[PDB]
Amino acid sequence: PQITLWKRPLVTIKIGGQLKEALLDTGADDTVIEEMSLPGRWKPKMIGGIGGFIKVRQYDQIIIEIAGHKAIGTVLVGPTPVNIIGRNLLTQIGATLNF
Amino acid sequence: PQITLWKRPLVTIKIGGQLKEALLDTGADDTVIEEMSLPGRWKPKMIGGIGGFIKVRQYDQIIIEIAGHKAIGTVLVGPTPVNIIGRNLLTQIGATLNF
Numbered sequence: 001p002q003i004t005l006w007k008r009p010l011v012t013i014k015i016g017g018q019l020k021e022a023l024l025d026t027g028a029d030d031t032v033i034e035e036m037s038l039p040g041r042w043k044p045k046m047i048g049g050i051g052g053f054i055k056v057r058q059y060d061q062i063i064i065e066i067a068g069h070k071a072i073g074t075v076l077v078g079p080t081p082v083n084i085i086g087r088n089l090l091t092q093i094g095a096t097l098n099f
Numbered sequence: 100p101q102i103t104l105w106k107r108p109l110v111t112i113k114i115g116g117q118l119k120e121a122l123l124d125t126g127a128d129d130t131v132i133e134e135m136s137l138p139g140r141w142k143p144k145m146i147g148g149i150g151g152f153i154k155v156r157q158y159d160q161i162i163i164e165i166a167g168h169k170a171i172g173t174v175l176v177g178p179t180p181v182n183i184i185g186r187n188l189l190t191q192i193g194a195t196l197n198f
């Protein structure tokens with residue numbers, strides 16, 4: 001699809017068996033999801049943006065279906081104000097910015 | 100152009116006669132640049148990022164070139180990890196996300 005930027009680029013994702021709404025975010029290096037449980041090993045990480053840093057749990061090798069397209073990679077879990085699909089997974093679904 | 104996302108989508112911008120680097124950020128409604136001098140009056144605005152809220156100075160109707168494309172619109176000035184081009188200006192340059 002061609003997603004307009006007149007509105008926030010929100011899509012439905014499936015992660016950990018759960019449906020969520022998330023932002024397709026070219027400004028995010030990594031994918032960050034609100035608090036949830038995920039299987040397997042994790043390690044702590046700090047990520048920063050406007051207003052400073054939050055602590056997250058880093059889970060590797062997690063599958064996420066993004067608007068119907070499956071992708072595997074690292075997912076960060078923590079107190080983010082919005083679910084964010086970052087570049088690490090946008091690449092895997094072939095997303096590009098066009099103008 | 101067609102910009103893939105294996106690297107950060109950094110472009111050159113021109114504002115006030117000066118070249119700067121900025122990140123094309125579909126996850127931002129608005130454009131935020133690091134401290135600089137802009138003409139005219141400003142208004143107050145709060146931005147809630149991943150780490151919390153910050154105060155910024157809102158300047159309206161500012162001339163800015165983005166990757167060689169001309170825009171005239173709102174620029175926020177305040178403390179950001181990186182200059183961010185948000186949707187208010189991505190729409191002016193005709194950007195879309197595609198997959």
Ligand SMILES: COc1ccc(S(=O)(=O)N(CC(C)C)C[C@@H](O)[C@H](Cc2ccccc2)NC(=O)c2cc(C)cc(C(=O)N(C)Cc3nc(C)oc3C)c2)cc1
Nearest residue numbers: 027028029030047048049081082126127128129147148149
């Ligand atoms: C290492 O991986 C990282 C992943 C993400 C981030 S980040 O979320 O901090 N961020 C990085 C960027 C600042 C360099 C990605 C940005 O796209 C974030 C994503 C994000 C959106 C909303 C809330 C938190 C984070 N946007 C803004 O900072 C940002 C900046 C401006 C100037 C405006 C807005 C904006 O439109 N809103 C705050 C509206 C809003 N509010 C809520 C609650 O949701 C949304 C969509 C967002 C940092 C590290």
Ligand SMILES: [Cl-]
Nearest residue numbers: 072073074088
């Ligand atoms: Cl990854």
Ligand SMILES: [Cl-]
Nearest residue numbers: 091094103104
């Ligand atoms: Cl590619």
Ligand SMILES: [Cl-]
Nearest residue numbers: 172173187188
């Ligand atoms: Cl604007």
Ligand code: NA
Nearest residue numbers: 040041060061
């Ligand atoms: Na894992």
Ligand code: NA
Nearest residue numbers: 135136137138
């Ligand atoms: Na000034």
Ligand code: NA
Nearest residue numbers: 139158159160
């Ligand atoms: Na103005």
